[PDB]
Design an enzyme around this catalytic site. Structure first.
Site, PDB file in Angstrom:
ATOM      1  CG  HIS A  39     -55.018   4.345 -14.504  1.00 15.01           C
ATOM      2  ND1 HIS A  39     -55.893   4.371 -15.289  1.00 15.01           N
ATOM      3  CD2 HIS A  39     -54.749   5.112 -13.685  1.00 15.01           C
ATOM      4  CE1 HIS A  39     -56.126   5.868 -15.114  1.00 15.01           C
ATOM      5  NE2 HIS A  39     -55.876   6.290 -14.046  1.00 15.01           N
ATOM      6  CG  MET A  91     -47.783   3.869 -12.979  1.00 13.38           C
ATOM      7  SD  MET A  91     -49.125   4.420 -13.566  1.00 13.38           S
ATOM      8  CE  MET A  91     -50.347   4.316 -12.317  1.00 13.38           C
TER       9      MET A  91
END
Length: 98
Positions: A39, A91
């Protein structure tokens, strides 16, 4: 007032929780790494604030569960951010600071 967020939802979805939030001018967001790693957190620079001091980098990375980066902002308005390797998968999000 003083927020936190988890990168990688508890369902294993490539989204940050909360993916949209509301704090006021000078407060922060202290996001952490929680699922389907890696991430990242990069803001878009929506106005005059230094998103470059409230984002990771277009190369910074959270790869291990519990890693983190913190952001603090004060330009009244809403600013956009996303995760580089997951942008096209959803995302992406928007913060508000007033």
């Amino acid at each position: 007032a003083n927020a936190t967020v988890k990168m990688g939802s508890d369902s294993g979805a490539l989204v940050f929780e909360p993916s949209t939030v509301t704090i006021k001018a000078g407060e922060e967001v202290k996001w952490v790494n929680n699922k389907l790693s890696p991430h990242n957190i990069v803001f878009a620079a929506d106005g005059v604030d230094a998103d470059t001091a409230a984002k990771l980098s277009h190369k910074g990375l959270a790869f291990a569960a519990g890693e983190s980066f913190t952001s603090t902002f004060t330009e009244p308005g809403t600013y956009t951010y996303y995760c580089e390797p997951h942008r096209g998968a959803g995302m992406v999000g928007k913060v508000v600071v007033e």
